[PDB]
Coordinates of C-alpha atoms and ligand atoms in Angstrom, one line a residue:
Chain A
X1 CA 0.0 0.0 0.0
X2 CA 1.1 3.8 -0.4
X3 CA 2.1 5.5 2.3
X4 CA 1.8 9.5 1.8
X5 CA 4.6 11.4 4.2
X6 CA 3.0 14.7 5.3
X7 CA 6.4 15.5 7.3
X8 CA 5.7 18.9 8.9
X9 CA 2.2 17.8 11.1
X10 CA 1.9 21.8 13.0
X11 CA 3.2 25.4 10.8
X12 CA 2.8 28.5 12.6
X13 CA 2.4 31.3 9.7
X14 CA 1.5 34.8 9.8
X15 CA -1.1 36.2 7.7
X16 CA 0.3 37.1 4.4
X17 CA 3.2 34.7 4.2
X18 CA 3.5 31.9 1.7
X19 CA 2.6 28.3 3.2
X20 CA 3.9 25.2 1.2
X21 CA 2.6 22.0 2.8
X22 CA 4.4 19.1 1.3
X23 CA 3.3 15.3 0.7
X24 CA 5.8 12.5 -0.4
X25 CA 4.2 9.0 -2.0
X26 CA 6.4 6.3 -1.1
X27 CA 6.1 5.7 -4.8
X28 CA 5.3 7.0 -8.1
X29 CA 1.5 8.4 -8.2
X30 CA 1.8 10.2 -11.2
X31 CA -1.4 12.9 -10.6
X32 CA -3.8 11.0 -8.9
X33 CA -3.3 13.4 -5.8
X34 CA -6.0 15.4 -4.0
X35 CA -5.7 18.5 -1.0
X36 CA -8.4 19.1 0.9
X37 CA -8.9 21.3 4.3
X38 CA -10.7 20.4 7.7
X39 CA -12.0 22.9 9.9
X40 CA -13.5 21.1 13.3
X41 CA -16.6 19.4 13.7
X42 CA -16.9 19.7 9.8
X43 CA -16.2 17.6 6.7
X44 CA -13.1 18.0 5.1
X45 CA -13.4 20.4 1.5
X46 CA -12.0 19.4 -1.5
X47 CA -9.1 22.4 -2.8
X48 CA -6.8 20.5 -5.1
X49 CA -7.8 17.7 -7.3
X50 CA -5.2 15.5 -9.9
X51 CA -2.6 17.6 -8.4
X52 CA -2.7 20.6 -9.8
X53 CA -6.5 22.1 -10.4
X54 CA -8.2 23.9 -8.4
X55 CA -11.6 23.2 -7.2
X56 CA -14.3 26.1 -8.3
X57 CA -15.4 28.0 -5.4
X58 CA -11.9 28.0 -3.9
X59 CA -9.6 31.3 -3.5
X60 CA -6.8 31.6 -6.5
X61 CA -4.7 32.1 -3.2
X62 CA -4.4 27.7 -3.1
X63 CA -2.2 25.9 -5.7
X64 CA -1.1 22.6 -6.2
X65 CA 2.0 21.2 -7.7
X66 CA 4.1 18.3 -8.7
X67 CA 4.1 14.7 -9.7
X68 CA 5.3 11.8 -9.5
X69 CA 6.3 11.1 -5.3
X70 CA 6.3 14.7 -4.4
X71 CA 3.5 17.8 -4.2
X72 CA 3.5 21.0 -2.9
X73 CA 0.1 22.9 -1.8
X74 CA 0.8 26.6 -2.0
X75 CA -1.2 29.1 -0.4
X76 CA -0.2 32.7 -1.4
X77 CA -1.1 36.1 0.8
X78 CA -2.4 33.6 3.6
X79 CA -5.5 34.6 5.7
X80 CA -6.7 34.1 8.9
X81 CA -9.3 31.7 7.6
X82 CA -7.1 29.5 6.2
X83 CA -6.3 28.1 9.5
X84 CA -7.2 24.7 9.0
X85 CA -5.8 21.4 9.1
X86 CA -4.8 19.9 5.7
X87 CA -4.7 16.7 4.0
X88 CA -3.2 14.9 0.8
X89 CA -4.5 11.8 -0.6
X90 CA -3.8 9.6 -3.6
X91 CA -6.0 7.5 -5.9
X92 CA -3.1 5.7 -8.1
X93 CA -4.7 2.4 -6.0
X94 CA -6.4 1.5 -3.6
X95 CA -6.6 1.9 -0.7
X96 CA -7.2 5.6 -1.1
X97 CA -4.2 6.5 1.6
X98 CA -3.7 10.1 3.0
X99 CA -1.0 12.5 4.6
X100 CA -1.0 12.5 7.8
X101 CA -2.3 16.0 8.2
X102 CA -0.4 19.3 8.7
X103 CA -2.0 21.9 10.9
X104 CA -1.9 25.6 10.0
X105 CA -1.8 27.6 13.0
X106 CA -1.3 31.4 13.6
X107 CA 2.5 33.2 14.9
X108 CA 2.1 36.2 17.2
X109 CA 4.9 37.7 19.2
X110 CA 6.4 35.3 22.0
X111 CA 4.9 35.4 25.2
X112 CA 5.9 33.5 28.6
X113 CA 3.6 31.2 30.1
X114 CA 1.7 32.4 33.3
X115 CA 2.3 29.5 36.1
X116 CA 0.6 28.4 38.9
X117 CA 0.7 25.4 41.1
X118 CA -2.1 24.2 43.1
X119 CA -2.5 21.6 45.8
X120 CA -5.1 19.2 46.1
X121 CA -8.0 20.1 47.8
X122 CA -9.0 18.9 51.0
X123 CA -12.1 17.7 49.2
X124 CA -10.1 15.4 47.2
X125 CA -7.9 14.0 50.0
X126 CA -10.9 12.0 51.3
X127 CA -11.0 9.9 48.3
X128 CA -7.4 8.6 48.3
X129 CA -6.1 9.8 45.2
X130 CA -4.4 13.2 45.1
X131 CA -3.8 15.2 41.9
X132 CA -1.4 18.4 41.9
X133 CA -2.2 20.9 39.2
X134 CA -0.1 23.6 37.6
X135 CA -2.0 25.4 34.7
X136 CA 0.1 27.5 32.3
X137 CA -2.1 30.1 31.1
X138 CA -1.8 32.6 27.7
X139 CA 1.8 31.5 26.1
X140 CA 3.2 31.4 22.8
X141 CA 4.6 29.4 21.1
X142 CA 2.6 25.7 21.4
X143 CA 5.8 24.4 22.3
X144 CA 6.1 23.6 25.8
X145 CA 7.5 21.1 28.4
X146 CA 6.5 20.2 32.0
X147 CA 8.5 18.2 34.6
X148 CA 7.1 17.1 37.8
X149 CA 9.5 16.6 41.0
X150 CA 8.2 15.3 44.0
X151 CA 10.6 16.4 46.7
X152 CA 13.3 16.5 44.4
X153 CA 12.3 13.4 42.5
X154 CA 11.4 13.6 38.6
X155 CA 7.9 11.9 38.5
X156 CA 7.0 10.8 34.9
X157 CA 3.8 8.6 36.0
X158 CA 0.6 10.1 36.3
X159 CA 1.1 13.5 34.9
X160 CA -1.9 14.1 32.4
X161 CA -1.5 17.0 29.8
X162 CA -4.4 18.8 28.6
X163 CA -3.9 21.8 25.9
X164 CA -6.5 24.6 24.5
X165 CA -6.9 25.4 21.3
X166 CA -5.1 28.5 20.1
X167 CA -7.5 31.0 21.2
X168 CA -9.5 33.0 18.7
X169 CA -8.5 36.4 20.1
X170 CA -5.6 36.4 21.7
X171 CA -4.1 33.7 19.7
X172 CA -1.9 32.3 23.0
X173 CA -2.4 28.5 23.9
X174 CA -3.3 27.0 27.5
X175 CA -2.2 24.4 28.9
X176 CA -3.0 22.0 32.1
X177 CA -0.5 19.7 33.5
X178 CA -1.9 17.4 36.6
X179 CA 0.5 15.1 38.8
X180 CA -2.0 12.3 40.2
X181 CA -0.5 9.8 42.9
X182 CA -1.9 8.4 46.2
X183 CA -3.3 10.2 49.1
X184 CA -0.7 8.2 50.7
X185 CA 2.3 8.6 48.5
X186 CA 1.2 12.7 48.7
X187 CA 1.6 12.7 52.6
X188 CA 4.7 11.2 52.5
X189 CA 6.0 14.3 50.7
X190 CA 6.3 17.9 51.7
X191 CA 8.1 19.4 48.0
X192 CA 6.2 20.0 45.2
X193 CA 7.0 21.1 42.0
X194 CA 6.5 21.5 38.1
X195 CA 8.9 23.1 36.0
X196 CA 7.9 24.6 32.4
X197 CA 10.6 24.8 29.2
X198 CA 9.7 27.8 27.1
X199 CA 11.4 29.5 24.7
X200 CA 10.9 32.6 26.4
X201 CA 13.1 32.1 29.3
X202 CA 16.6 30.5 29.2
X203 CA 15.8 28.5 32.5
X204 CA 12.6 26.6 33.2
X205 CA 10.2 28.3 35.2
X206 CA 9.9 26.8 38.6
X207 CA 6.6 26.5 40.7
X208 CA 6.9 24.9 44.2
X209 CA 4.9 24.7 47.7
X210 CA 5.4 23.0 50.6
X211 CA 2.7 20.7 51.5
X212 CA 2.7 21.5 55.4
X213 CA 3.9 25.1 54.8
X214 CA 1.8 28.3 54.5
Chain B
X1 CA -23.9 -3.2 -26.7
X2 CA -26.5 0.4 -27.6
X3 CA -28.0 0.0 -30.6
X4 CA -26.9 1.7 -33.9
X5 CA -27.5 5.2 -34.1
X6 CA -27.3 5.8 -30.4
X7 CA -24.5 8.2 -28.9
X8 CA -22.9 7.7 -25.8
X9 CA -23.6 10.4 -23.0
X10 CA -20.5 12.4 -21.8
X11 CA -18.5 10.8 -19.0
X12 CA -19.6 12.6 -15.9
X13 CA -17.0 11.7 -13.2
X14 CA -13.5 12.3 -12.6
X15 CA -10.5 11.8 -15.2
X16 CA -6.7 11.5 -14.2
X17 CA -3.9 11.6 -16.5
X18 CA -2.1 8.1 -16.0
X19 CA 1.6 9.8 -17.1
X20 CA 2.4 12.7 -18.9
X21 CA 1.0 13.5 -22.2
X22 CA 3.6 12.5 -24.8
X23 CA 4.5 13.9 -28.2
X24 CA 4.7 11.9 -31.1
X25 CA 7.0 11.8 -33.8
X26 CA 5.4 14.3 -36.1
X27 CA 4.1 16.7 -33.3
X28 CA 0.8 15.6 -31.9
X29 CA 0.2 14.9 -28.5
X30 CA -1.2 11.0 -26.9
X31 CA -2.9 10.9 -23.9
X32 CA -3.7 8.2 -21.7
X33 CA -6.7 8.8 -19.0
X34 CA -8.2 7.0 -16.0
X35 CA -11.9 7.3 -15.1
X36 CA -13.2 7.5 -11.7
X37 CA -16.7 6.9 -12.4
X38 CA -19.5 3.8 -13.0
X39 CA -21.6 5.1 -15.6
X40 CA -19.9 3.8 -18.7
X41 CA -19.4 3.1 -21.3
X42 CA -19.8 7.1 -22.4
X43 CA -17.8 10.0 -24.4
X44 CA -14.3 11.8 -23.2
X45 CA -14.6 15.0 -23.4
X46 CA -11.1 15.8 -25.0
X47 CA -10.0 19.4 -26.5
X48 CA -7.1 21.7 -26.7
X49 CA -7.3 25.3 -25.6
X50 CA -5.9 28.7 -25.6
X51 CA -8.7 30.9 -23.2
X52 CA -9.5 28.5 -19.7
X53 CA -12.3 30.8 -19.8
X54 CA -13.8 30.8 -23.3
X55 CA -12.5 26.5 -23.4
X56 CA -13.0 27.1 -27.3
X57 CA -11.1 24.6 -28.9
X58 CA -8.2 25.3 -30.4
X59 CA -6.0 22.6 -33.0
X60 CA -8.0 19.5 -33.4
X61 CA -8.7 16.2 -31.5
X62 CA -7.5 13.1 -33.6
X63 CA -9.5 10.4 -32.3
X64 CA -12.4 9.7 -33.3
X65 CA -15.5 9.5 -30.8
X66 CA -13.0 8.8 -27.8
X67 CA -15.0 6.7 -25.4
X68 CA -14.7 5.0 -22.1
X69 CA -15.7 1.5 -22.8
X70 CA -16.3 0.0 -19.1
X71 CA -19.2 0.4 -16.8
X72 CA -16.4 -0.6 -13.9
X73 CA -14.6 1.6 -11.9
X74 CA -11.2 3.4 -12.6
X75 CA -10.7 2.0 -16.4
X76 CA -8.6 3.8 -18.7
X77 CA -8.6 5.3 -22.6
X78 CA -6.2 6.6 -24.6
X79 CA -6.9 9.4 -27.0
X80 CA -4.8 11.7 -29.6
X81 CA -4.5 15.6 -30.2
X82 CA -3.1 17.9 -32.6
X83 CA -1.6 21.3 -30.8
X84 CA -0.9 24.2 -32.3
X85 CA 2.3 25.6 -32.2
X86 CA 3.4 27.2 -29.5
X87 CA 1.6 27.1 -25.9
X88 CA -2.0 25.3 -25.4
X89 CA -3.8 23.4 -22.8
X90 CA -5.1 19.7 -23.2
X91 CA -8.1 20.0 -21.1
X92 CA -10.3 16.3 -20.2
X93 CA -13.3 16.3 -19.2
X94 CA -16.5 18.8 -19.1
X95 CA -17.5 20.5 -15.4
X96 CA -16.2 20.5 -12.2
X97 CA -13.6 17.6 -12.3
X98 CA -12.1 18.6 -15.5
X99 CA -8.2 18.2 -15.9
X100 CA -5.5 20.3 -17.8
X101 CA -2.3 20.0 -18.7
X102 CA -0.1 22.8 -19.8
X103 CA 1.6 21.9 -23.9
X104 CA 4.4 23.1 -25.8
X105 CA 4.9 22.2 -29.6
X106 CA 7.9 23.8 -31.0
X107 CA 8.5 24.2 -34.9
Chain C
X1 CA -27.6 19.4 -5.9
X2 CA -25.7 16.1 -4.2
X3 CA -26.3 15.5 -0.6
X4 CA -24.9 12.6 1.3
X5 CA -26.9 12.2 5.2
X6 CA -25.1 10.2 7.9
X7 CA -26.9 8.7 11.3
X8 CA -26.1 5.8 13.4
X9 CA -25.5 5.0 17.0
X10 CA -23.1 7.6 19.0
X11 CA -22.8 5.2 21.9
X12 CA -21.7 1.4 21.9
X13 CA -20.5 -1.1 24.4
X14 CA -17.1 -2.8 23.3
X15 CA -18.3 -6.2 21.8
X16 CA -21.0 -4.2 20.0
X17 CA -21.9 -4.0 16.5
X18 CA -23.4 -1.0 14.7
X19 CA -24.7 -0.1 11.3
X20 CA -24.0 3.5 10.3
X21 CA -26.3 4.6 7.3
X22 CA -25.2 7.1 4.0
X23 CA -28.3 8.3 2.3
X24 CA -27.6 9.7 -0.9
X25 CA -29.4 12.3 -3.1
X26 CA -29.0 14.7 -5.9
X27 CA -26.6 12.6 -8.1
X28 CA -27.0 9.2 -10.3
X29 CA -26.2 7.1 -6.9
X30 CA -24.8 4.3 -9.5
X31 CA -22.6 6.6 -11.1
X32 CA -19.8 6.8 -8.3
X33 CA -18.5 5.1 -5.3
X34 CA -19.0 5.5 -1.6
X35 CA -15.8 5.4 0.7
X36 CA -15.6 5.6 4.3
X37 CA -13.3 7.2 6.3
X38 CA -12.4 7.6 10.4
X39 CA -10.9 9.8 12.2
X40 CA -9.5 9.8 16.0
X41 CA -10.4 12.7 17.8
X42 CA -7.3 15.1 17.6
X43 CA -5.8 12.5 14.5
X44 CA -5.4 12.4 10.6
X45 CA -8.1 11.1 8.1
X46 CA -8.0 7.5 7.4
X47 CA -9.7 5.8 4.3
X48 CA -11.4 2.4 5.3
X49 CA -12.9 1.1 1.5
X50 CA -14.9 2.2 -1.1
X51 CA -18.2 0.3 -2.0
X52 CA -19.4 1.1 -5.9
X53 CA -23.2 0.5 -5.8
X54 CA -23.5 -0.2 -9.5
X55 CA -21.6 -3.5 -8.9
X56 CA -21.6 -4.1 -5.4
X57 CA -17.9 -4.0 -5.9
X58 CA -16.1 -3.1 -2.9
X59 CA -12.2 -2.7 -1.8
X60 CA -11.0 -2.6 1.7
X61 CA -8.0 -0.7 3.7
X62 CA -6.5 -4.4 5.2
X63 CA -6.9 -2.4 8.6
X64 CA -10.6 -1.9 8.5
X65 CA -10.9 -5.6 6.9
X66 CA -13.7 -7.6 9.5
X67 CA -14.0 -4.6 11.4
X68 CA -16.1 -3.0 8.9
X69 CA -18.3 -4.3 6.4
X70 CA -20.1 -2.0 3.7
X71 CA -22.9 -2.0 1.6
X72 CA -25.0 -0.5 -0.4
X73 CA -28.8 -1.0 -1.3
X74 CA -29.4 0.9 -5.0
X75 CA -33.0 1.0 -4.5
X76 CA -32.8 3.7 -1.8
X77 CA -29.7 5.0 -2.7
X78 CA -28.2 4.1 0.5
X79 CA -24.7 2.9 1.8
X80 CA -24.0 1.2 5.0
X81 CA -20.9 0.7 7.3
X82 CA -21.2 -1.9 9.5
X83 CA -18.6 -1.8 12.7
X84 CA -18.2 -5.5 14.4
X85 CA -16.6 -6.1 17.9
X86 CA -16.2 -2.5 18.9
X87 CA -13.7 -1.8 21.1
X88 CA -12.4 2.2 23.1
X89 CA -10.1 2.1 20.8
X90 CA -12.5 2.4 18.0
X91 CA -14.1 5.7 19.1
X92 CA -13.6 8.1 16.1
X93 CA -15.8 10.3 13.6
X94 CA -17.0 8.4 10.7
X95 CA -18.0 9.6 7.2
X96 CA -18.9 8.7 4.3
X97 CA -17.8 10.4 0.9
X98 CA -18.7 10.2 -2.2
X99 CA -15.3 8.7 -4.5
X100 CA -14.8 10.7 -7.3
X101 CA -10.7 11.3 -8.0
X102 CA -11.3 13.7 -4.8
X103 CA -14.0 13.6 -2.8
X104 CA -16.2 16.9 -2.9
X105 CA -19.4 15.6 -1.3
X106 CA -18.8 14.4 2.2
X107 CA -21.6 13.4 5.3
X108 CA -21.6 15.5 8.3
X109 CA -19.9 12.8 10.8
X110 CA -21.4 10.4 12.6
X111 CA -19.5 10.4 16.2
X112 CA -19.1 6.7 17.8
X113 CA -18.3 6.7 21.9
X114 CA -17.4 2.7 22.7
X115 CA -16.8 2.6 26.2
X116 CA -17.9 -0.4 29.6
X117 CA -18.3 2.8 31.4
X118 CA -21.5 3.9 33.2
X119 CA -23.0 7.1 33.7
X120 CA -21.3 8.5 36.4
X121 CA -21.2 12.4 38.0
X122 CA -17.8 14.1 38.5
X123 CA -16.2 14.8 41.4
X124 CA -15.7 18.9 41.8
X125 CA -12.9 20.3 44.1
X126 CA -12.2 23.7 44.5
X127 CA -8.6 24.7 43.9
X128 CA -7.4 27.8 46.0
X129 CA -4.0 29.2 45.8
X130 CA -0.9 27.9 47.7
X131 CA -2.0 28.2 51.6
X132 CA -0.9 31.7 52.2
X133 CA -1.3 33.5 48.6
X134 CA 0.5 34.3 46.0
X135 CA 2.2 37.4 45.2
X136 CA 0.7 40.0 42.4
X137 CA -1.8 41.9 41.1
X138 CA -3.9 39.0 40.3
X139 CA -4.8 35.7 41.4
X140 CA -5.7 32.6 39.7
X141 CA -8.4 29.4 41.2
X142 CA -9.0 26.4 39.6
X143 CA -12.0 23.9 39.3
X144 CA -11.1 20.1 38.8
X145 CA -13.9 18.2 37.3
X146 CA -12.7 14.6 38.0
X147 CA -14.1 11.0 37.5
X148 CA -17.6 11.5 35.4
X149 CA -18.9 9.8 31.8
X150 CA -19.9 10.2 29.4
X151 CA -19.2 13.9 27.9
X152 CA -20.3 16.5 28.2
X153 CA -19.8 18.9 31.5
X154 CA -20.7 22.9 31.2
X155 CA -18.3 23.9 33.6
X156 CA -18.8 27.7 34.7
X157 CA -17.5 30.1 37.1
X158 CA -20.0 32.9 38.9
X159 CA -23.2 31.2 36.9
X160 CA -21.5 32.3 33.4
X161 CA -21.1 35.8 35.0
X162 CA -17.4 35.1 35.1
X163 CA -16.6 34.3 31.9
X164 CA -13.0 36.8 30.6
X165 CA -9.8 35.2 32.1
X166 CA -11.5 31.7 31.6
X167 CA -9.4 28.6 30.3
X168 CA -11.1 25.7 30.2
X169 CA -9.4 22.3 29.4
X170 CA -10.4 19.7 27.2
X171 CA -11.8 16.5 29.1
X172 CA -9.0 13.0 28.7
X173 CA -10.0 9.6 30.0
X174 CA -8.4 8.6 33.1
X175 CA -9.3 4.9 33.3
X176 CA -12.2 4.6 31.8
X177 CA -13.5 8.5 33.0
X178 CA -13.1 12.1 31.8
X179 CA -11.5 14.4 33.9
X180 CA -10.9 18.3 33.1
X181 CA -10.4 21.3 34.8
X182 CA -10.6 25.1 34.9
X183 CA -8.7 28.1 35.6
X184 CA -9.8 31.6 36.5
X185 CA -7.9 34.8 36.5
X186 CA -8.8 38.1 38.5
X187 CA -7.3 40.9 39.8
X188 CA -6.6 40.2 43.6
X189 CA -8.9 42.8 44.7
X190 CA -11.9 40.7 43.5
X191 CA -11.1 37.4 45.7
X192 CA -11.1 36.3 48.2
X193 CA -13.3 39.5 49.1
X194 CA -15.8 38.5 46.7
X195 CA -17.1 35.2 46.1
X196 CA -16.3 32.9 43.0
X197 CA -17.8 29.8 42.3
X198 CA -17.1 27.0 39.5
X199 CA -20.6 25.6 38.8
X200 CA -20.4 21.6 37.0
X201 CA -23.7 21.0 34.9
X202 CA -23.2 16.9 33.9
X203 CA -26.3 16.4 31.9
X204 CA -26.5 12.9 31.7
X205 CA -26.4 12.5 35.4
X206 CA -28.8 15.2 35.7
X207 CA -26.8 16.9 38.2
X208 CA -25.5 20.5 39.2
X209 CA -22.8 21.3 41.4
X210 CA -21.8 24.4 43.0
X211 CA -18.4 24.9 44.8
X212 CA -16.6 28.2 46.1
X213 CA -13.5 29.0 46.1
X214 CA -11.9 29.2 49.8
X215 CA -8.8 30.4 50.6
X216 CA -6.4 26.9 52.3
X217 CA -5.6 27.7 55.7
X218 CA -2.7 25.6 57.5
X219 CA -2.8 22.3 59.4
Ligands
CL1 CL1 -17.4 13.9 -5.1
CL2 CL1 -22.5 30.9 41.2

């Protein structure tokens, strides 16, 4: 079967720049390739069809090119409502393979994440599990890593990661990060911390309490 | 097999060319096309043009009454074209899935 | 004009089967195929076969072979997808699309839950700052929604009257039940001095709980 190689799966463009979303076949496909875009909780649209006509109805701002293993979908003078994710697929044989999707997203300037760490609540602590949560709020860009220590410890298991989508306004992303052990493992600790890698500072930023401290 | 006298409708689904169009010894172009449709047998459309907009036909399609002959999915036909000299399109197909591809015939 | 109308079950046990229908309309239903293809929440497009009702002809994606099964019925213009032994990991949207060299005409989705789970409200907790505060002009709580199925919550804070400053995290199975939470910025002039309180609706529970936000005090 054919395997098309979307390499690139996230972009970060501004509005106005050129984006060029590539798709390798892991062999010769001639034309037979389609682009379409996917906004979410909708169908995919058709843009691009035999590689390199456009469908009517769609802006002269999206091009396809190439053949053979390798095609290009240009979008010229990009706008905001391009933001999409986008597909290839090919119909040399079946089955009917696609990319694996890149994901247009928007660049605004760098901004650090907000951070703040939060205990469990005494509500939880009846129930025997305990789950420590650091939210970083309103950064840019996506990329972003979280390391949990547990008085000095690196803790790996049971962190959970949850992420907004970029937001429609501001266009920073969210994120939640949540350390769950035991009740009983937590009360055998008093140092708690997550620690964010940003681009915008050289050094993590640190967030810490002590459990029996206030 | 329609009975005599009868034409074929045009093919109403999606062509693909199945490799480049290739020129031929004395300037003309061949063609080979796959189909993506099931109502078959019916009639390629198959032109050169100049104007995308205007699609009138420009040089001359060679073969005669270029059909797809299978009511089966993603069969294939091969047809001929004259260009004229210089730049044209070969443009398949009539409507919203119709294919071109950009020709050069030099003197 | 061509139209292409999906239904079918949203919820399944694993070990169940389902039939998800395509009704087509506006086109020759003979004249093209009818493919099927998933997608994970958050993943890429996959194509699962193509059925061509003219023939009956169909080709499968060797994934999806067994654990799908289409068909088509030309006297309604109808296509069907039938999912067999249904397990989490086959929760996904499904569509059908018509196959034409690129496929223009798609259904709207047809979203398929499979989860042993049963209804079950969240657990709510309150989440006040560090014991003691935190420096700044502003402050941020937290609401963690923990332990419920199936989706959705409404999750608000002030009965929707606090809405700016709001992030609000998408829900991710934690053995077998969603948890999410949500933060809330103010400026610290606002709280503790005046109340704030995350508010969990969980529909399918029929349940509605309120809990404020109280500053920790020590051991
Ligand atoms: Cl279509
Ligand atoms: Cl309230």
């Amino acid at each position: 079967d054919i395997v098309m190689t979307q390499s690139q799966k996230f972009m970060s463009t501004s509005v106005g720049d050129r984006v060029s979303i590539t798709c390798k076949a892991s062999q010769n496909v001639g034309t037979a390739v389609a682009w379409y875009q996917q906004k979410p909780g909708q169908s995919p649209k058709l843009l691009i069809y035999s590689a390199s006509n456009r469908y009517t109805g769609v802006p002269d701002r999206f091009t396809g090119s190439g053949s053979g293993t390798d095609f290009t979908l240009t979008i010229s003078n990009m706008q905001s409502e391009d933001l999409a994710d986008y597909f290839c697929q090919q119909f040399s044989s079946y089955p009917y393979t696609f990319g694996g999707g890149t994901k247009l997203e928007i660049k605004r300037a760098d901004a650090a994440p907000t951070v703040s760490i939060f205990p469990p609540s005494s509500e939880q602590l009846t129930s025997g599990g305990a789950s420590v949560v650091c939210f970083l709020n309103n950064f840019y860009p996506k990329d972003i890593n979280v390391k949990w220590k547990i008085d000095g410890s690196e803790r790996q298991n049971g962190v959970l990661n949850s992420w907004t989508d970029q937001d429609s306004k501001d266009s920073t992303y969210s994120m939640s990060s949540t350390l769950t052990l035991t009740k009983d493992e937590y009360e055998r600790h008093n140092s708690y911390t997550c620690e964010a890698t940003h681009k915008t500072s050289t050094s993590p930023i640190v967030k810490s309490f002590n459990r029996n401290e206030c | 097999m329609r009975l005599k006298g009868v034409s074929y409708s045009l093919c109403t689904a999606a062509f693909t060319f199945t490799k480049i169009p290739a020129e031929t010894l004395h300037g003309t172009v061949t063609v080979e096309v796959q189909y993506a449709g099931t109502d078959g047998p019916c009639k390629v459309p198959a032109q050169m043009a100049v104007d995308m907009q205007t699609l009138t036909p420009v040089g001359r399609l060679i073969t005669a009454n270029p059909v797809i002959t299978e009511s089966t999915e993603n069969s294939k036909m091969m047809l001929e074209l004259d260009p004229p000299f210089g730049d044209s399109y070969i443009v398949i197909g009539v409507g919203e899935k119709k294919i071109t591809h950009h020709w050069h015939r030099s003197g | 004009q061509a139209q292409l109308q999906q239904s079918g079950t949203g919820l399944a046990r694993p070990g169940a089967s389902v039939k998800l229908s395509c009704k087509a309309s506006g086109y020759t239903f003979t004249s093209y195929g009818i493919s099927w293809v998933t997608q994970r929440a958050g993943q890429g497009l996959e194509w699962i076969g193509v059925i061509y009702p003219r023939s009956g002809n169909t080709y499968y994606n060797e994934k999806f072979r067994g654990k799908a099964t289409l068909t088509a019925d030309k006297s309604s213009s109808s296509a069907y997808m039938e999912l067999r032994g249904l397990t989490a990991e086959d929760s996904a949207v499904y569509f059908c699309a018509r196959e034409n060299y690129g496929s223009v005409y798609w259904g709207q989705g047809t979203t398929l839950t499979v989860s042993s789970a049963k209804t079950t409200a969240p657990s709510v907790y309150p989440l006040a700052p560090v014991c003691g505060g935190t420096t700044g002009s502003s402050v941020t709580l937290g609401c963690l929604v923990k332990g419920y199925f199936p989706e959705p919550v409404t999750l608000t804070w002030n009965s929707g009257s606090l809405s700016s400053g709001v992030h609000t995290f998408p829900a991710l199975l934690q053995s077998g039940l969603y948890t999410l939470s949500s933060s809330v910025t103010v400026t610290s002039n606002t709280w503790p001095s005046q109340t704030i309180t995350c508010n969990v609706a969980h529909p399918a529970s029929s349940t509605k709980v309120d809990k404020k936000i109280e500053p920790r005090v020590p051991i």
